[PDB]
Amino acid sequence: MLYNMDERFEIKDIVAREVIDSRGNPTVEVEVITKGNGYGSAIVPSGASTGTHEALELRDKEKRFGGKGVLMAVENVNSIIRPEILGYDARMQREIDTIMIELDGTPNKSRLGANAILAVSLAVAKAAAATAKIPLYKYLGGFNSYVMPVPMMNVINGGKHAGNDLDLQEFMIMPVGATSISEAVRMGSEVYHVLKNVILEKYGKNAVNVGDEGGFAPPLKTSREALDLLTESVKKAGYEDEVVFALDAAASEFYKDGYYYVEGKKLTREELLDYYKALVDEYPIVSIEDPFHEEDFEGFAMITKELDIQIVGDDLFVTNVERLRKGIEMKAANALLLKVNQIGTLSEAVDAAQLAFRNGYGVVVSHRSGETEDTTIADLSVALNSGQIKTGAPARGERTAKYNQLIRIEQELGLSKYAGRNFRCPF
Amino acid sequence: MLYNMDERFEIKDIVAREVIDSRGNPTVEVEVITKGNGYGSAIVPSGASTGTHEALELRDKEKRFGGKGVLMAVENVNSIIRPEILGYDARMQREIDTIMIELDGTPNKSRLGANAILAVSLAVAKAAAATAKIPLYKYLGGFNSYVMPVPMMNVINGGKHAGNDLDLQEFMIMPVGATSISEAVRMGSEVYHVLKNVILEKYGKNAVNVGDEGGFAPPLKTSREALDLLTESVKKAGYEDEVVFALDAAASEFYKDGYYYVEGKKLTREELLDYYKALVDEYPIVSIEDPFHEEDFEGFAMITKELDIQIVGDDLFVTNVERLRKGIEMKAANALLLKVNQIGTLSEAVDAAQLAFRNGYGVVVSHRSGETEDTTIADLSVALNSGQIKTGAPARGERTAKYNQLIRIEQELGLSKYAGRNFRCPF
16 A cells, blocks of 8 residues: 555665674674664574574684684675665565575575574564654564563573583573562562572582573582472572472483483483473472473473473474474474574564464573573563563573563553463463 | 754653662663653662762662662652753753752762662763764763773682682783774683683583673682683683783772781781782783772872882772872872762763873773663763773673673774773873
């Protein structure tokens, strides 16, 4: 319709640059401005430049920055993508994402880089929203974007790079009993601080430094020890009835040649499944991410059918539609861990979220280990009314920036709804 | 003059809210918008609610957030400060800061809170700059703002809360040999990652978690051990001739009844001075912060005269103009550590910087232990052409956000000057 034509949404300029993430590694930032002076800026988190199914970032692999520079991806934005979308209607998100996908030419965006493409994709959306003068989450998800997500906070770290002897990767708290995102953030922070002091008093002043996501790595060796510590902290914080637990097993990490090595024992899939069953019977664990290795679709289906909780597929799906579709057909897992930079564009990410949603799956909007001060996933979680977000412990700016943005969004909304106990389907 | 009157600069609205900092503790954020639609937003870092010489933050002391809530400070902005400056010319920074100072009425802003006052002070400046359409650093320091600062990066932590047995608080690397802020950030990051690997191979996988400012806390006991590790890392990184060292002794922390307890010894001021002197003679240490306790002006004058390096007064001055003047008259120290939230307003902070500058003192624009995603100090260091900034290790979003802002400013300038080895006086 000609009445919708508006020169103000035409992209006037686009600029990309190399900045650093929360771990000191390079990453891409892109700025976009329209003729109507609508400004958008986005920074993508770090991802993978090598992988079997996810979209791949383009890394320079030169001497500088340990071979992790992104000058090539930046140049791709400034010299290759830019001329193809200058003057384009910023509102045509899917068309712009498609132009980039086709320009790259490869299924996994390995030529121009998933980091270059996603940075532009996010910046364009922000610039269009700014030009329309519609809050970002409203522009992304329509007028009916109002559900604040329950945050899954990784406060106790495990795995081979945590420092301790814990096999499971993430032990998280979820303030499902809070009545607002503001309260949820406070409960999380208070529990985090009680936990810090419990660890300090019990393990010493040398045991409270933090991991990449802000969580602690106390000297524990069993899941029950970690869960007992969380329980102790939650109880002492005073939120026993409002906080539940979520786990990210990242089982592929302790799986090898047919067996899972947990707490000094070699377990078969069935044995690990009973291991999980016991934990769920002993603690308020409402969600388990990657209970089995990244290719065990059958295993995922088994635990999804046997347990009555949320089973999140992370490495199992790597935000890949084809793998998600296979999971849905097999009833493998009942939730998708959504990592926007694993797929490459906003259009694709939302399409993936919709496929999950429409087949009864929950969607967990997720951060990456290497994050930035960019807070797009906060707006995205509200735009999708996902009901849940995973963006770190309530510490470290690349994590707290999201929590603050969630707080701002909640205040900006006249009437909002905190997903709470209905985090899977907040409707 | 009548032609300078412009309704576009009138403050149209002001809103304050409680968000959280990088450690999960509450802090104040303020938004300001002018009639001309110029928008500004700022978040203040952690400070001190008790003291006898510095501006005091206002904390709620309620059950929530461990008594660290700032709802009162927020209400002071929304209900007390707001009505007094609504409609005021945003360009009149000193006038607005003065209004808040007099409205509070106390010598240390302890009634309304230094956190409430500074948040407004900063947000107003940003809104004014946005209205004028002048880059923030240019609006703050005039057209001649173009010097990019040398960053002092705290990569090895010490002190009673670091986790190890190091007496000195901060062991920093300074890429004085870089040719741009972009290269400086890269050098810092590369050395940081080499350091991380050296600590891993020497002390194990459980020794690389980070402190509040992103630095590591290896199990060391002596300054030489710490300095040898930095030397080893810098060499492996290949920057022997481009990276030098800076120390923050925070000597007040280990001072008691006339003596300094360092490395299992009880030293007098004079013996501690020789301690520092020996280190400077063995390592490329170009700056030492707070070598003696916060009231030892005489001691500072002594080491400043005996050594030929930069001696920074931090706790000694607590960004207090009167204390700085006393130091200048006594030739105590030759650099000021500038913490805007230690004084309370932009106007006062800049006046303190000028007093230092004009008396041959260097000025190190600094962050606080509890930081946020706010990047104002990046623009401030350039506005003041300070030549040096202390904003953390190249890790953790509340630190990396500043480095990214410096990279952005450097690119926007076109023609910029990296202070380099002339960090004290880049002219």
